[PDB]
Design brief:
The structure is cut from a larger assembly and holds two copies of chain A, one copy of chain B (979 residues) and one copy of chain C (115 residues).
Chain A lengths: L1 H4 L10 E8 L12 H8 L12 E7 L1 H6 L4 H12 L5 E3 L8 E4 L8 H12 L6
Antiparallel strand pairs in A: 1-2, 2-4, 3-4
Chain B lengths: L6 H15 L4 H14 L10 E3 L3 E11 L3 E3 L5 E3 L2 H6 L5 E13 L5 E15 L14 H4 L13 E3 L2 E4 L2 E5 L4 E4 L6 E8 L11 E7 L6 E4 L7 E2 H8 L4 H8 L6 H12 L7 H9 L9 H15 L11 H19 L14 E4 L1 H27 L8 H4 L2 H13 L8 E2 L5 H8 L2 E2 L30 E2 L6 E2 L6 H9 L17 E5 L2 E6 L2 H14 L8 E5 L4 E5 L5 E7 L9 H8 L8 H6 L3 E5 H4 L4 E2 L18 E2 L22 H12 L17 E4 L7 E2 L2 H4 L9 E7 L11 E4 H6 L4 E10 L4 E2 L19 E2 L8 E3 L5 E2 L10 E10 L5 E11 L6 E4 L5 E7 L6 E2 L7 E3 L10 H16 L3 E2 L9 H9 L8 E2 L1 E2 L11 E10 L4 H5 L1
Parallel strand pairs in B: 9-17, 20-23, 26-27, 29-43, 30-42, 31-40
Antiparallel strand pairs in B: 1-2, 2-5, 3-4, 5-6, 7-8, 8-16, 9-15, 10-11, 11-12, 12-13, 13-14, 17-18, 19-24, 20-21, 22-23, 24-25, 24-27, 28-32, 30-46, 31-42, 32-38, 33-35, 34-37, 35-36, 37-38, 39-40, 39-46, 41-45, 44-46
Helix pairs in contact in B: 1-17, 2-11, 5-8, 6-10, 8-9, 11-13, 23-24
Chain C lengths: L14 E5 L4 E5 L6 E3 L4 E5 L7 H4 L12 E2 L12 E4 L13 E4 L7 E3 L1
Antiparallel strand pairs in C: 1-2, 2-3, 5-6, 6-7, 7-8
The chains are: A alpha+beta (131), B alpha+beta (979), C mainly beta (115).
The structure holds zinc ion.
C-alpha cells in the first residue's frame, strides 16, 4: 500500500472534504471559533509578515480517512503549495492528530476582485497540486 | 358480479368484441379519417390570404368538398371507379377534391368587386382503402363479394399506379417536451432540448437548447434558432423583459429555500451583469445571426422577431406572450438545474413515451402543406405574369391540379420523402397484416428492445440482418391516437380553479402542481389529486375528454401533463377498483350476445370499465398481469392495483401470434418464426383469381393448425391459412436428415403436400409500339397476344409487340429465362392516355422437390433432404408413415421443445377431435395434461411410438417421437431460382 | 454556509465588498450604491462531499403513489399510522445511495423519516 | 439495513449488483448440473450432452432446469420506466422476480414478464451477433 500511494495520482480533490472562504476582521479575532487557540499559537513570532496578509482567508478541511490512506501529512501539503506558488501564499496547517484537521491559506499582497481572485486560485489549485 | 375461474372466456370475448369492433388496421383508418376530415379542412386556417398589387387583387379559400372516387376517360366522361378496377390498371384510386374560392378586385375606385367560384376542382387526392370516404366503407360481405373485393381484406392502403402502397408510421421524437441529456465528448455537461411547434401550422422544426458547460464555473448557455453564436441564458431572460435579477431567479427557481440551485446558477448571472437593460440584451442577441442588422435598431427588431416567434413557438407567438415564454424558459432551466444535481434522472432517448408515430395522417398532412405552398407559389407566378396588362384574371386557368396530383403520386409511389410507402406485401395474409402494422425507427440506441415497448410493440417480431431492431410491429391491442383539439380540456380547466400562469406570483409555484397541456405550461393547481380524479372520471365518461387523451401525474416532480396530440401509442386495458375489476359478469353477458344487441366495444369503453393507457401514463400506473390471482389475499406484494391487462398474450404482434406456446421457446426462435411467417406460402387473399399481382403463390390445401392460439382467431388465419398439418417424426433415418434438412414422403407429396400454383403477371404498354403477331410466334394469336390456356415452354414468346423503325424492330417479351407454365388470363385495356396495354397472368405448378424449403412454427428454414415413397418411409404399428422426418439433433440448433409440445398437442387434438389451444400464458394447459390426454387415447403419454424400418421391416430399437405438426412452405424454391 | 442577499431598490444581486476605512465585509450591488452589513462573514462554502439531507427533498405528496411499495411493519412515529411507503434515494452523484426513506400514508397528514 | 461493508474497488451499487448476479449465476449453474446429472442412461438429451458439450450444456439446462437470469449490456434488466422494469412491479424492486431472472424452465413455460425479459435478452444477442459477424469479417479481410 505504501508503494501504491506514491504511484496513484492524488490531487487536492481526493484529500479535501470541504472548502470555504471566510473574511477575517483580524487574524487574532479568528471568526472560526475552533481554530482560535491554534491561530494565537501560530501567529505569535511569525515567519511571514502579518501586515502583508490578505483580509480574506481560504479554509479547507481535509478528509482524515483519505489522508491516512495515502500516508499524507500537513507539511508535505504546505511544501507542495510553497513550491507551486512561492513564498507569497502563506499557508498554515493545524495539526495531524487533532480532531477535525484543517488548514488555512492567505495571500501576500504584492484589479478585478479580491474574492473572485481567491476563487480562481482555488479552482486552478484544487486539481493541479499533484500531492 | 364477479367472474372467478371464468376469466378466460370473459377476457377472450372482450378481445373478440374489441377486434370485431375496431379491426387490425384501425389506427391507419382512423388517422386517414382524421387527416381528411380535419387536416385537409384546416389546411387553410393560418396561411395569409393571397394579396397582389395600383389595382389590388385578393384571393381566399372558403371550404373543401371531397366526393367519391371517380375516373375520367380520354374523352373526359366521369364514371364511378372501383378498387378492383383501379388495381387491374396501373392508375391511382383517387377521389377529386374541390375548393370554394373568393376573388376580390379593387381598381382604386373606392369599390371592391368580389366573385365566388364554387366547387373549384383543386385536385385529385388518393383515397385509402376501407376508409370512411372509400366506396367499400359500410359494405356487407355480399356487397364485397359482388364487386370483386375480399371481405377479409383489411384495407388501410392506397392504390398508386395500380400498386398497393402502404404508409409506414415514422418514429420521431415527441414535440413540445423538455429532455435533458448528457453527452460525453461534448463540452456541455447537461443539455436541455425542447422541440416545439404549433400543431403543423408552419415551420415543422423549431427547437432551442438550454445547456451548461462542464467544469473541466457552471455556466448556463442557451442556443436559439437563427442564432449562430452561443447566448447566455440571463441575457435572453433580460431580453424577454425581466431586467431585475430577482425576477429572473423567480422564473428559474420557484423555491428560494433551496440554496444549492442558486449557488450553482450564480455563474450565469455573473457572466451577464454588464447587460442590465432590455434594449441592450436585444442588441446583443440581434448582433449575432445569419443576417446581422445594419444598424442597432434593426438588430433589436430582428432579435424581437426571433424571440417572439422563431424560438419556443408552442408556448405562444402572440404580441403579448413574453411572460409565458419566460416562464417556460425558466422551467427548462429549472429542469436542467435539477437534473444536474441528480434530483431527476436523465431523460432516456430509448424511452418509448418520448416518441411519436406519424401515421398516414400526419405524413399526408405534411405533403399536402408542401404541395399547397408550391401551388400557391405557382399561382402567384402566374398572376404576376398575367397581371402586367391588368385586363382581367381567371381562377380556372390559374389553378394547377396537376401539381398536387403529381406530387401525391410521386410521394406515394416512389416513396421519396426514403423507407416509406413501399409496395404492400401480398404474399401471405399474416404478411399483409404485419406490413400494414409496422413501425420504422428514425435512425437510418434503437437497436435494443426497450422496457417501455411492453404492450406497445411486439417484442418477438423484428427483421434480421442490418435492419434488426429498426423495423418493429404493433401489438394486437396497440392503437395510435389520431389527435384531438386541446381546447375543451382547456375551457374545462379554467372552469375549475387552475390558477392561471399569467396571474400567479412566482412564490405560489413552489408548492403548487404545474399543469401542462400538450407540453404547454397552461398553469398551476393547488390540489392535484382531486383534479386528476375529476379528469379520470371525465375521461371514463367521455363527456368532455375523449378516451385517447393521455393524462399523467408526476407526483414527485409535482407536475400534471395532458397530451392530446396525434402520434402517441396506447393500448386499452381494464380499470381496477380498490381490489376489484370494473368488468362485471353483466358486461360479459351483454358482450356474449354481441349481435342483435348493439353492445360493442365502444359501449364497454364508455361504461368506464376499460380505458386506453399510453406509454406516458404507464409509469404512473401499476398494472395487474391477471385478475385471477393478483387481487386475491396472499403474502402482500402490492395492494394498490389500479389497472389490469385484458390478456398478456396481447403483447405479441400478428406474426408472433402464429407461434403456438411461444413462451416455451426462446426469443431468437420467435423472431425467426415471425420472419418466416411473412414468406410462408399459402392462400393470401380470397379474390386472388380476379386480381393480378406479380409473384403470387397459392397453396392447394391450406389447413387450420391442430395447435392454435386464440389470437389467431382474430387474425382470420383459420379463415385462410398458409401451411399444412403433416405427420412429422423426429428421427435420423438415412443421413438426408441433417441439421436443417428434412425428408418427406414422396407418395404423400404425390397425394398433395404443399402443391402450389405460382401466378406471374407481365404488363406491357404500347405508345407512340403495337400488339401484333410478327410474320417462336406460333402460339401467338391474331391480336399479338396468346390466348390463355396454352402451355408455354422456355425460350417462348407470350407477347407479340412490334415497334416502328423510323424492317420493323421487335420489342417482344420472353418468358424470363424458361419460366415454364400455363397461361391463366389475358387482359387488354386502355390506359389514361387511351393507349392499349395488356396484362398476362401465367400459372406454374410447383410440386415440392428436394430443394424446396419448409419450416415448422418452431425451427429454422430447412430444405428437403430426399423424398421416399410410403414403403420406403418408416411405419408404425397402425401403418401411419410419417409425413416428414426431421433431425433429432437440431434441438439445440433450430427447433425447440415448443415444437415437441406442438406435436403432442396436435396428436391429442387429432385423437380427441377438438382443436388444441396453445395460448401463450394459460397456466391450465401444460405438458402433463397433454401427456395424460394422449395416454387416454391408447398412445404413449410422451408421444413416442414404435416404428418399423421401411426398407427391412425391422422394428426400430428407439421409439420415434411422431405427431402432427403445422408446417409452412416458403417462397424460396429451386424452381423459382433455376430461371 | 451562504444563502442569497438581494438589493432592494434595484432588486438585484448583492456582491461581497470590502471597505478599508471600516475594514469589514459588506454586500453591495454593483449597479447601484446600496450597501448592507454582512453577518455570516463567509462568502461561500464548497461541499465536495455532497452531504445533503434527502428528507428535505422528499415531499409528502408522493405518499399517495399506487406504484410505490406500501409497507405495514414500520409505523409512523409522529401519528401512529402503521401503513407507510418506503423508497430508495434514487439520486445521482451519491455513491452511497440505497437508503430507504419512509413517508407516512396518513390522510394528507404526511411525515418523512428513515429507520 | 446496509451495514454490509462494501467490497474495495467498487461502490455499493456495483458491489451489490455483483453479489446478486453471482448468486443467480451459481444457482443457475447448480440447477443445470443437477438436471444434467438427472439423465441416467435413456434420455436422448444426455447422448448429445456427453458427446457434444461444446455449447449444448446451457441449452439443455435451460430446457430442463431453469432458463436463468436475462442480462442486458452485461447487467440485469434496466429500469426502463421510472425506477421500475415493467408496470406490473413495484418501484425500486431489486428482487429476483424483476430485473430479468426466469425462474421457470422452457418446459414449464415463461411468465409474461419473464417472456418479455427473455425477448430483451434475445434482441441484445441478435444485435451482438449482427455486429460481431461484420466486425470479424472486416478483421479477417484486413489481416489477410
Ligand atoms: Zn443593488
Amino acid at each position: 500500500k505504501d508503494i501504491l500511494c506514491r504511484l496513484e495520482h492524488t490531487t487536492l480533490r481526493k484529500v479535501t472534504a470541504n472548502t470555504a472562504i471566510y473574511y477575517d476582521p483580524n487574524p487574532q479575532s479568528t471568526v472560526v471559533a475552533e481554530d482560535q487557540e491554534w491561530v494565537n499559537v501560530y501567529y505569535e513570532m511569525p515567519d511571514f509578515d502579518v501586515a502583508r496578509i490578505s483580509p480574506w482567508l481560504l479554509r479547507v478541511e481535509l478528509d482524515r480517512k483519505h489522508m491516512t490512506d495515502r500516508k499524507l501529512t500537513m507539511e508535505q501539503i504546505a511544501e507542495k503549495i510553497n513550491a507551486g506558488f512561492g513564498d507569497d501564499l502563506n499557508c498554515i496547517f493545524n495539526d495531524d492528530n487533532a480532531e477535525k484537521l484543517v488548514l488555512r491559506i492567505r495571500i501576500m499582497n504584492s484589479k478585478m476582485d479580491d474574492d473572485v481572485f481567491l476563487r480562481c486560485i482555488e479552482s486552478n489549485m484544487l486539481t493541479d497540486m499533484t500531492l | 358480479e364477479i367472474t372467478p375461474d371464468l376469466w378466460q372466456e370473459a377476457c377472450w370475448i372482450v378481445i373478440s368484441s374489441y377486434f370485431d369492433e375496431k379491426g387490425l388496421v384501425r389506427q391507419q383508418l382512423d388517422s386517414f379519417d382524421e387527416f381528411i376530415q380535419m387536416s385537409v379542412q384546416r389546411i387553410v386556417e393560418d396561411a395569409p390570404p393571397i394579396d397582389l398589387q395600383p389595382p389590388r387583387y385578393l384571393l381566399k379559400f372558403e371550404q373543401i368538398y371531397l366526393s367519391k372516387p371517380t375516373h375520367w376517360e380520354r374523352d373526359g366522361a366521369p364514371s364511378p371507379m372501383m378498387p378492383n378496377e383501379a388495381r387491374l390498371r396501373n392508375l391511382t384510386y383517387s377521389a377529386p377534391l374541390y375548393v370554394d374560392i373568393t376573388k376580390t378586385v379593387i381598381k382604386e375606385g373606392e369599390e371592391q368587386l368580389q366573385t365566388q367560384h364554387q366547387k373549384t376542382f383543386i385536385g385529385k387526392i388518393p383515397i385509402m382503402l376501407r376508409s370512411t370516404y372509400c366506396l367499400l366503407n359500410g359494405l356487407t360481405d355480399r356487397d364485397l363479394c359482388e364487386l370483386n373485393e375480399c371481405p377479409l381484406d383489411p384495407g388501410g392502403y392506397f392504390i398508386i399506379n395500380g400498386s398497393e402502397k402502404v404508409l409506414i408510421a415514422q418514429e420521431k421524437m415527441a414535440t413540445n417536451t423538455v429532455y435533458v441529456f448528457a453527452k460525453k465528448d461534448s463540452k456541455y455537461a447537461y443539455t436541455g432540448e425542447c422541440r416545439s411547434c404549433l400543431e403543423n401550422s408552419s415551420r415543422p422544426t423549431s427547437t432551442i437548447w438550454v445547456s451548461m458547460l462542464a467544469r473541466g464555473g457552471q455556466r448556463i448557455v442557451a442556443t436559439l434558432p437563427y442564432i449562430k453564436q452561443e447566448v447566455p441564458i440571463i441575457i435572453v431572460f433580460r431580453a424577454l423583459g425581466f431586467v431585475s435579477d430577482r425576477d429572473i431567479l423567480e422564473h428559474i427557481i420557484y423555491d428560494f429555500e433551496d440554496p444549492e440551485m442558486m449557488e450553482m446558477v450564480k455563474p450565469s448571472l455573473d457572466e451577464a451583469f454588464v447587460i442590465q437593460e432590455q434594449n441592450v440584451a436585444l442588441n446583443f442577441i440581434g448582433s449575432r445571426g445569419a443576417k446581422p442588422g445594419v444598424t442597432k435598431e434593426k438588430r433589436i427588431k430582428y432579435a424581437k422577431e426571433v424571440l417572439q416567434k422563431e424560438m419556443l413557438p408552442h408556448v405562444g407567438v402572440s404580441d403579448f406572450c413574453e411572460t409565458k415564454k419566460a416562464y417556460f424558459l425558466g422551467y427548462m432551466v429549472h429542469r436542467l438545474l435539477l437534473a444536474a444535481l441528480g434530483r431527476r434522472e436523465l431523460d432516456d432517448r430509448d424511452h418509448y413515451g418520448n416518441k411519436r408515430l406519424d401515421l398516414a395522417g400526419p405524413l399526408l398532412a405534411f405533403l399536402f402543406r408542401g404541395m399547397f405552398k408550391n401551388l400557391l407559389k405557382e399561382v402567384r407566378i402566374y398572376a404576376q405574369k398575367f397581371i402586367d396588362r391588368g385586363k382581367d384574371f381567371n381562377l380556372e386557368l390559374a389553378i394547377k391540379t396537376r401539381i398536387i396530383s403529381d406530387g401525391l403520386k410521386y410521394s406515394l409511389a416512389t416513396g421519396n420523402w426514403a423507407g416509406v410507402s413501399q409496395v404492400l406485401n401480398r404474399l401471405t395474409f399474416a404478411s399483409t397484416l404485419s406490413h400494414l402494422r409496422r413501425l420504422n425507427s428514425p435512425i437510418g440506441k434503437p437497436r435494443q428492445l426497450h422496457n417501455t415497448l411492453w404492450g406497445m410493440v411486439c417484442p418477438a417480431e423484428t427483421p434480421e440482418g442490418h435492419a434488426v431492431g429498426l423495423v418493429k410491429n404493433l401489438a394486437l391491442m396497440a392503437y395510435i391516437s389520431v389527435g384531438s383539439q386541446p381546447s375543451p380540456i382547456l375551457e374545462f380547466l379554467e372552469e375549475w380553479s387552475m390558477e392561471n400562469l399569467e396571474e400567479i406570483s412566482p412564490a405560489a409555484i413552489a408548492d403548487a402542481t404545474k399543469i401542462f397541456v400538450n407540453g404547454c405550461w397552461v398553469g398551476i393547481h393547488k390540489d392535484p389529486e382531486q383534479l386528476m380524479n375529476t379528469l379520470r372520471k371525465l375521461r371514463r365518461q367521455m363527456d368532455i375528454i375523449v378516451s385517447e387523451v393521455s393524462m399523467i401525474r408526476d407526483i414527485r416532480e409535482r407536475e400534471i401533463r395532458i397530451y392530446t396530440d396525434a402520434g402517441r401509442i396506447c393500448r386499452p386495458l381494464l380499470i381496477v377498483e380498490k381490489q376489484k375489476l370494473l368488468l362485471k359478469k353483466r358486461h360479459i353477458d351483454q358482450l356474449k350476445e354481441r349481435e342483435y344487441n348493439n353492445y360493442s366495444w365502444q359501449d364497454l369503453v364508455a361504461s368506464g370499465v376499460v380505458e386506453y393507457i399510453d406509454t406516458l401514463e404507464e409509469e404512473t400506473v401499476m398494472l395487474a398481469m391477471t385478475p385471477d390471482d393478483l387481487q386475491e389475499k396472499e403474502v402482500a406484494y402490492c395492494s394498490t392495483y389500479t389497472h389490469c391487462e385484458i390478456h398478456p398474450s396481447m403483447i405479441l404482434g400478428v406474426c408472433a401470434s402464429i407461434i403456438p406456446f411461444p413462451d416455451h421457446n426462446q426469443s431468437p426462435r420467435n423472431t425467426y418464426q415471425s420472419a418466416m411467417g411473412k414468406q410462408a406460402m399459402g392462400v393470401y387473399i380470397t379474390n386472388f383469381h380476379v386480381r393480378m399481382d406479380t409473384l403470387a403463390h397459392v397453396l392447394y390445401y391450406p389447413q387450420k393448425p391442430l395447435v392454435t392460439t386464440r389470437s389467431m382467431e382474430y387474425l382470420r388465419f383459420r379463415e385462410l391459412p398458409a401451411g399444412i398439418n403433416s405427420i412429422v417424426a423426429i428421427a435420423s433415418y438415412t443421413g438426408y436428415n441433417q441439421e436443417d434438412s428434412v425428408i418427406m414422403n414422396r407418395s404423400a407429396v404425390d397425394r398433395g403436400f404443399f402443391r402450389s400454383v405460382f401466378y406471374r403477371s407481365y404488363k406491357e404498354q404500347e405508345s407512340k409500339e403495337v400488339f401484333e403477331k410478327p410474320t417462336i410466334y406460333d402460339k401467338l394469336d391474331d391480336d399479338g397476344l396468346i390466348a390463355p390456356g396454352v402451355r408455354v415452354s422456355g425460350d417462348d414468346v407470350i407477347i407479340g409487340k412490334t415497334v416502328t423503325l423510323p424492317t420493323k424492330r421487335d420489342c417482344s417479351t420472353f418468358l424470363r429465362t424458361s419460366e415454364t407454365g400455363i397461361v391463366d388470363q389475358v387482359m387488354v385495356t386502355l390506359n389514361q392516355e387511351g393507349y392499349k396495354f395488356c396484362k398476362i397472368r401465367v400459372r406454374s405448378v410447383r410440386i415440392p422437390q428436394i430443394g424446396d424449403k419448409f419450416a415448422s412454427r418452431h425451427g429454422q428454414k430447412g430444405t428437403c433432404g430426399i423424398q421416399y415413397r410410403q414403403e420406403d418411409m418408416p411405419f408404425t404399428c397402425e401403418g401411419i408413415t410419417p409425413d416428414i422426418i426431421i433431425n433429432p439433433h437440431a434441438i439445440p440448433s433450430r427447433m425447440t421443445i415448443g415444437h415437441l409440445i406442438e406435436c403432442l398437442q396436435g396428436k391429442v387434438s387429432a385423437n380427441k377431435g377438438e382443436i388444441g389451444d396453445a395460448t401463450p400464458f394459460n397456466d391450465a394447459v401444460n405438458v402433463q395434461k397433454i401427456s395424460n390426454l394422449l395416454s387416454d387415447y391408447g398412445y404413449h403419454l410422451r408421444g413416442n411410438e414404435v416404428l418399423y424400418n421401411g426398407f427391412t421391416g425391422r422394428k426400430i430399437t428407439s421409439q420415434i417421437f411422431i405427431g402432427p405438426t403445422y408446417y409452412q412452405r416458403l417462397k424460396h424454391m429451386v424452381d423459382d431460382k433455376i430461371h | 454556509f451562504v444563502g442569497i442577499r438581494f438589493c432592494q431598490e434595484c432588486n438585484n444581486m448583492l456582491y461581497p465588498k470590502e471597505d478599508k476605512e471600516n475594514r469589514i465585509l459588506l454586500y453591495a450591488c454593483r449597479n447601484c450604491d446600496y450597501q448592507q452589513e454582512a453577518d455570516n462573514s463567509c462568502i461561500y462554502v464548497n461541499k465536495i462531499t455532497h452531504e445533503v439531507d434527502e428528507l428535505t427533498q422528499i415531499i409528502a405528496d408522493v405518499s399517495q403513489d399506487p406504484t410505490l411499495p406500501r409497507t405495514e411493519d414500520h409505523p409512523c412515529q409522529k401519528c401512529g399510522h402503521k401503513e407507510a411507503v418506503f423508497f430508495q434515494s434514487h439520486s445521482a452523484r451519491a455513491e452511497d445511495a440505497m437508503r430507504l426513506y419512509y413517508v407516512c400514508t396518513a390522510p394528507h397528514c404526511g411525515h418523512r423519516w428513515t429507520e | 439495513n446496509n451495514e454490509l461493508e462494501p467490497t474495495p474497488g467498487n461502490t455499493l451499487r456495483q458491489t451489490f449488483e455483483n453479489q446478486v448476479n453471482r448468486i443467480l449465476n451459481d444457482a443457475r449453474d447448480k440447477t443445470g448440473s443437477s438436471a444434467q446429472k438427472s439423465l441416467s442412461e435413456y434420455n436422448n438429451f444426455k447422448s448429445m450432452v456427453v458427446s457434444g458439450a461444446k455449447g449444448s450444456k446451457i441449452n439443455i439446462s435451460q430446457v430442463i432446469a431453469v432458463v436463468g437470469q436475462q442480462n442486458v449490456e452485461g447487467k440485469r434488466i434496466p429500469f426502463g420506466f421510472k425506477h421500475r422494469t415493467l408496470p406490473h412491479f413495484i418501484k425500486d424492486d431489486y428482487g429476483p422476480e424483476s430485473r430479468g431472472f426466469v425462474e421457470n424452465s422452457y418446459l414449464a413455460g415463461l411468465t409474461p414478464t419473464e417472456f418479455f425479459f427473455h425477448a430483451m435478452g434475445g434482441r441484445e444477442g441478435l444485435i451482438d451477433t449482427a455486429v460481431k459477424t461484420a466486425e470479424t469479417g472486416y478483421i479477417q479481410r484486413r489481416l489477410i
